[PDB]
Write an enzyme that holds these catalytic residues in place. Structure first.
Site, PDB file in Angstrom:
ATOM      1  N   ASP A  67       0.834  -1.638  -0.345  1.00 12.80           N
ATOM      2  CA  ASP A  67       0.023   0.262  -0.314  1.00 12.80           C
ATOM      3  C   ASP A  67       0.636   1.228  -0.067  1.00 12.80           C
ATOM      4  OD1 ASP A  67      -2.664   1.494   0.005  1.00 12.80           O
ATOM      5  OD2 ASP A  67      -2.069   1.718   2.109  1.00 12.80           O
TER       6      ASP A  67
ATOM      7  N   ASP B 247      -1.308   5.444  -6.032  1.00 14.37           N
ATOM      8  CA  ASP B 247      -1.919   4.225  -4.419  1.00 14.37           C
ATOM      9  C   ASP B 247      -1.945   3.257  -4.866  1.00 14.37           C
ATOM     10  OD1 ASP B 247      -2.747   2.962  -1.680  1.00 14.37           O
ATOM     11  OD2 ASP B 247      -4.396   4.278  -2.271  1.00 14.37           O
TER      12      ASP B 247
HETATM   13  C1  LIG Z   1      -3.953   7.326   7.576  1.00 15.48           C
HETATM   14  C2  LIG Z   1      -3.562   8.021   6.567  1.00 15.48           C
HETATM   15  C3  LIG Z   1      -3.158   7.895   5.575  1.00 15.48           C
HETATM   16  C4  LIG Z   1      -4.678   6.335   4.805  1.00 15.48           C
HETATM   17  N1  LIG Z   1      -4.312   6.228   2.836  1.00 15.48           N
HETATM   18  C5  LIG Z   1      -5.663   6.293   2.826  1.00 15.48           C
HETATM   19  O1  LIG Z   1      -6.526   5.719   3.035  1.00 15.48           O
HETATM   20  C6  LIG Z   1      -4.853   5.373   1.383  1.00 15.48           C
HETATM   21  C7  LIG Z   1      -5.440   6.718   0.271  1.00 15.48           C
HETATM   22  C8  LIG Z   1      -6.462   4.361   0.382  1.00 15.48           C
HETATM   23  C9  LIG Z   1      -5.433   3.472   1.272  1.00 15.48           C
HETATM   24  O2  LIG Z   1      -4.834   2.103  -0.222  1.00 15.48           O
HETATM   25  C10 LIG Z   1      -6.845   1.231   1.242  1.00 15.48           C
HETATM   26  C11 LIG Z   1      -6.031   0.569   1.362  1.00 15.48           C
HETATM   27  C12 LIG Z   1      -7.178  -0.549   2.115  1.00 15.48           C
HETATM   28  C13 LIG Z   1      -6.567  -2.148   1.561  1.00 15.48           C
HETATM   29  C14 LIG Z   1      -7.584  -0.562   3.429  1.00 15.48           C
HETATM   30  N2  LIG Z   1      -7.757   1.612   0.363  1.00 15.48           N
HETATM   31  C15 LIG Z   1      -9.251   3.179   0.561  1.00 15.48           C
HETATM   32  O3  LIG Z   1      -9.006   2.827   1.317  1.00 15.48           O
HETATM   33  C16 LIG Z   1      -9.685   2.355  -0.953  1.00 15.48           C
HETATM   34  C17 LIG Z   1     -11.113   2.806  -1.212  1.00 15.48           C
HETATM   35  C18 LIG Z   1     -11.836   3.142  -2.668  1.00 15.48           C
HETATM   36  S1  LIG Z   1     -12.785   4.060  -2.204  1.00 15.48           S
HETATM   37  C19 LIG Z   1     -13.679   3.653  -3.502  1.00 15.48           C
HETATM   38  N3  LIG Z   1     -10.198   0.480  -1.133  1.00 15.48           N
HETATM   39  C20 LIG Z   1     -10.084   0.151  -2.639  1.00 15.48           C
HETATM   40  O4  LIG Z   1      -9.728   0.641  -3.934  1.00 15.48           O
HETATM   41  C21 LIG Z   1     -10.306  -1.374  -2.213  1.00 15.48           C
HETATM   42  C22 LIG Z   1      -9.720  -2.592  -2.705  1.00 15.48           C
HETATM   43  C23 LIG Z   1      -8.473  -2.854  -1.894  1.00 15.48           C
HETATM   44  C24 LIG Z   1      -8.487  -3.371  -0.745  1.00 15.48           C
HETATM   45  C25 LIG Z   1      -7.015  -2.728  -2.614  1.00 15.48           C
END
Ligand SMILES: CCCCNC(=O)[C@H](C)C[C@H](O)[C@H](CC(C)C)NC(=O)[C@H](CCSC)NC(=O)CCC(C)C
EC number: 3.4.23.46
Length: 370
Positions: free
Chosen positions: A35, A220
């Site tokens: 990630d 990302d």
């Molecule tokens: C604490 C500060 C940093 C926070 N960073 C984030 O929130 C980043 C931008 C997003 C992060 O990469 C997470 C990862 C997921 C495995 C939870 N992804 C998502 O929330 C995203 C939200 C899409 S909104 C349609 N999840 C997905 O695309 C689904 C597939 C994943 C299981 C691979």
């Protein structure tokens, strides 16, 4: 050298790419999602319906408790747990062992995915966005600090189960064709970049370029979709609808809710436009572009697909559907991200994903949002 790391990623479409790691002594093996959109290393450490295995601190003689809690919210999903440190290795990575910060996840909500086959997450971005704060050293910073591994890594994410490579500590030239083109990392927190122009089937969207990066643009690997700021998303969908007006779709398709199908082999790829994102370059007034094919933003789920471009209120996210076309170099040492055409690109009949330059673009700094 790097050949040992080729093909070290696996995954299921739409569910993330993971690498194998071991934590603790004796080594406990876990699959860990890669990630670049976050900066915490965390693993399931308690039973969960969607986990087949998890981290057991009591069975590790090298585990140390930091006696501090932690919580991390993502765009979708969140977890809380207990901070500690332990020894970590990557079997199909460099031959080293590091003591790293690890969050043992004790409670979570919409974080783990049923059938994903991973049990943890490796946040590869910078300490600036680490929780609880930037004093918790991220894994890659620990790796570089404790070993001789150079301060960069590269990702080749391959689409249509799927796989790819994470080359830790360098670039493997067998994994791409053509030239690498680099864009500056604007600030070291997310991997933040600046988009300076957008075209759909060769037509400029003609928006104030600040709109493209409102309020940031990031790369990302842990987000599936291309996610666009509201105003940009609307302009893009309008243009894509017009290009494909030949056919008719449910309106829930464009919201990513409903899928569309066609008889096997008859998908009308031709009526869907290519999308070009121009990124800020490394010299004055110079940019370059990456071009996306419909095969990337129509995710396969007869042949049925979901629209994998969606709306954001927190800036642009260049997720897997963007990265899948390319070999992406996260060159932390030189504060830049490189793009090249991947060896594992998908095949359109009369069109090809590309990375092309140089272009001249004036007033690029004004595209960054404040
Ligand atoms: C604490 C500060 C940093 C926070 N960073 C984030 O929130 C980043 C931008 C997003 C992060 O990469 C997470 C990862 C997921 C495995 C939870 N992804 C998502 O929330 C995203 C939200 C899409 S909104 C349609 N999840 C997905 O695309 C689904 C597939 C994943 C299981 C691979």
């Amino acid at each position: 050298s790097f050949v040992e790391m080729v093909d070290n990623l696996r995954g299921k479409s739409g569910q993330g790419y993971y690498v194998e790691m071991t934590v603790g002594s004796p080594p406990q093996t876990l699959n860990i999602l890669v990630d670049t959109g976050s900066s915490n290393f965390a693993v399931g450490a308690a039973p969960h319906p969607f986990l087949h295995r998890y981290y057991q601190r009591q069975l590790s003689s090298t585990y140390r408790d930091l006696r501090k809690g932690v919580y991390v919210p993502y765009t979708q999903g969140k977890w809380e747990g207990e901070l500690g440190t332990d020894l970590v290795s990557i079997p199909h990575g460099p031959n080293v062992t590091v003591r790293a910060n690890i969050a043992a996840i004790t409670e979570s909500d919409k974080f783990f995915i049923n059938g994903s086959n991973w049990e943890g997450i490796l946040g590869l971005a910078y300490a600036e966005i680490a929780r609880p704060d930037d004093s918790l050293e991220p894994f890659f910073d620990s790796l570089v600090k404790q070993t001789h591994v150079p301060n960069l890594f590269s990702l080749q994410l391959c689409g249509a189960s799927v796989g790819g490579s994470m080359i830790i500590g360098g670039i493997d030239h067998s994994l791409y064709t053509g030239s690498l083109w680099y864009t500056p990392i604007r600030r070291e927190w997310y991997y933040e970049v600046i988009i300076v122009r957008v075209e759909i089937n060769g037509q400029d969207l003609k928006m104030d370029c600040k709109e493209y990066n409102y309020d940031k643009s990031i790369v990302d690997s842990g987000t599936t979709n291309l996610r666009l700021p509201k105003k940009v998303f609307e302009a893009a969908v309008k243009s894509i609808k017009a290009a494909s007006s030949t056919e008719k779709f449910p309106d829930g398709f464009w919201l990513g809710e409903q899928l569309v199908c066609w008889q096997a082999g008859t998908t009308p790829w031709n009526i869907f436009p290519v999308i070009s994102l121009y990124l800020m370059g490394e010299v004055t007034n110079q940019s370059f572009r990456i071009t996306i094919l419909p095969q990337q933003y129509l995710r396969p789920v007869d042949d049925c697909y979901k629209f994998a471009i969606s709306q954001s209120s927190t800036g642009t996210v260049m997720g897997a559907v963007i990265m899948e076309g390319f070999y992406v170099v996260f060159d932390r040492a030189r504060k830049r991200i490189g793009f090249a055409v991947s060896a594992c690109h998908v095949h359109d009949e009369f069109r090809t994903a590309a990375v092309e330059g140089p272009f001249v673009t004036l007033d690029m700094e004004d595209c960054g949002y404040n």
